[PDB]
Amino acid sequence: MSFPPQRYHYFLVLDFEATCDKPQIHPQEIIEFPILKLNGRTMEIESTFHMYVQPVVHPQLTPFCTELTGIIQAMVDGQPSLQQVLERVDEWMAKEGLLDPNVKSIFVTCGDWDLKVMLPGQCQYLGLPVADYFKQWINLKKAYSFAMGCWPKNGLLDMNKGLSLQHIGRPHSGIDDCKNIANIMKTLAYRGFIFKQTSK
Ligand SMILES: Nc1ncnc2c1ncn2[C@@H]1O[C@H](COP(=O)(O)O)[C@@H](O)[C@H]1O
Ligand SMILES: [Mg+2]
Ligand SMILES: [Mg+2]
């Protein structure tokens, strides 16, 4: 069946961008915080959270970071820091109705890095608690591997290739990466896939 019933009322698509450099900067810090709220059955985008984030440990974006992500210094200057952005997320979650225990939602990311490594690592560095809703997620690469029977080599680009989808927007823009996740999910649901939590 195409677009079967799903286990969640909403899927929350997230794909950070972070400071970076060649070789890699340390520590990395989140600079773009997107969440797309997808209707759980149709995978259509119903709401968007989007904030750029001001880094503090390495406050000046490197040339490599701006080239990779397209994020220029003026986009992070004057922004709230991660601590405040996380409070804005909680407020957005509340207004969207996602803190009701009987509304079931789950984050979806391309890989485990965002919520297994990046967010808890920075929150630990800053001494910040991680909200419980960030502690479960679906790794789209793993979901795709069950839906298609194969392991994608390079993330969103190869999942779009395998599904004959045109890429949306710019790779390594957090919000555009989220739109591609959402488009891949919609196609997997069209083919009949029922999404499941993959995080441990
Ligand atoms: N090729 C790369 N070299 C160095 N850092 C990278 C690279 N690709 C991604 N990153 C880092 O990982 C973050 C998330 O990657 P992505 O979602 O692919 O844009 C980026 O914002 C960078 O901080
Ligand atoms: Mg990513
Ligand atoms: Mg990204």
> Domain coordinates of the chain in residue numbers?
1-200
Q: In DSSP terms, which residues pair with 105 in a beta bridge?
A: 10
CA angle 106, 132, 154 (to 5 degrees): 45
Smallest CA-to-CA distance from 111 within 50, 168, 177 is with 177
Q: In DSSP terms, which residues pair with 112 in a beta bridge?
A: none
- Give the orientation angle of helix 119-126 with respect to helix 82-96, to 10 degrees: 120
Token pair for 53: 């984030």
Torsion sign (Cα): 55, 57, 61, 65: negative
CB half-sphere exposure, 22, CA atoms < 13 A = 6
**Amino acid at position 176, single letter:** D
**Amino acid at position 192, single letter:** G
- Cα dihedral value 11, 129, 172, 170, nearest 10: 50
Region of residue 184 (left: phi > 0; alpha: psi -120 to 50; beta: else): alpha
Q: Is 167 a catalytic residue?
A: no
Experimental method: X-ray
Distance 15 CA to ligand 3 centre (A): 5
Smallest CA-to-CA distance from 155 within 140, 173, 137, 136 is with 140
Please tell me whether 158 is known to bind a ligand. no
Q: Measuring from atom 6 of ligand 1, which residue has the nearest CA?
A: 20
Token pair for 2: 């195409």
Question: What does the alpha-carbon distance between residue 107 and residue 133 come to, in Å, rounded to a whole number?
Answer: 8
Ligand 1 proximal residues by C-beta, below 6 Å = 15-18, 20, 24, 28, 68-69, 172, 177
Question: What does the alpha-carbon distance between residue 164 and residue 56 come to, in Å, rounded to a whole number?
Answer: 41
Chain-centroid distance, C-alpha 95: 19
Task: From the candidates 9, 17, 50, 58, give the one annotated as an active-site residue.
Answer: 17
Please tell me whether 96 is known to bind a ligand. no
Question: What does the alpha-carbon distance between residue 200 and residue 197 come to, in Å, rounded to a whole number?
Answer: 8
Cα separation values, 168 from 24, 34, 130, 172, 173, Å: 27, 15, 30, 11, 10
Region of residue 23 (left: phi > 0; alpha: psi -120 to 50; beta: else): beta
Residues 6 or more apart whose Cβ sits within 8 Å of residue 116: 199
Please tell me whether 114 is known to bind a ligand. yes
Q: In this structure, how many other beta carbons lie within 10 angstroms of the beta carbon of residue 172?
A: 18
* Mutation to probe ligand 1, out of 13, 172, 181 (largest number of atoms < 8 A from CB): 172
**Amino acid at position 161, single letter:** K
Helix (H, G, I), strand (E, B) or coil at 163: helix
Backbone angles phi, psi at 186, to 5 degrees: -60, -40
Q: Is 17 a catalytic residue?
A: yes
Ligand nearest to the CA of 25: 1
Ligand 1 atom closest to the CA of 31, numbered from 1: 21
Smallest CA-to-CA distance from 110 within 155, 146, 63 is with 155
Question: Tokens 């009322």 label which residue?
Answer: 9
In the chain, DSSP finds a helix count (H) and a strand count (E) of: 7, 6
Cα separation values, 28 from 109, 182, 189, 198, Å: 18, 26, 34, 25
Q: Measuring from atom 21 of ligand 1, which residue has the nearest CA?
A: 17
Helices in the chain by DSSP H: which ranges?
63-69, 73-76, 82-96, 119-126, 140-148, 155-163, 174-190
Distance 31 CA to ligand 1 centre (A): 11
Smallest CA-to-CA distance from 114 within 144, 140, 148 is with 140
Question: What does the alpha-carbon distance between residue 87 and residue 119 come to, in Å, rounded to a whole number?
Answer: 14
Q: Measuring from atom 16 of ligand 1, which residue has the nearest CA?
A: 172
Task: From the candidates 29, 32, 96, 172, give the one annotated as an active-site residue.
Answer: 172
Residues 6 or more apart whose Cβ sits within 8 Å of residue 123: 82, 86, 129, 130
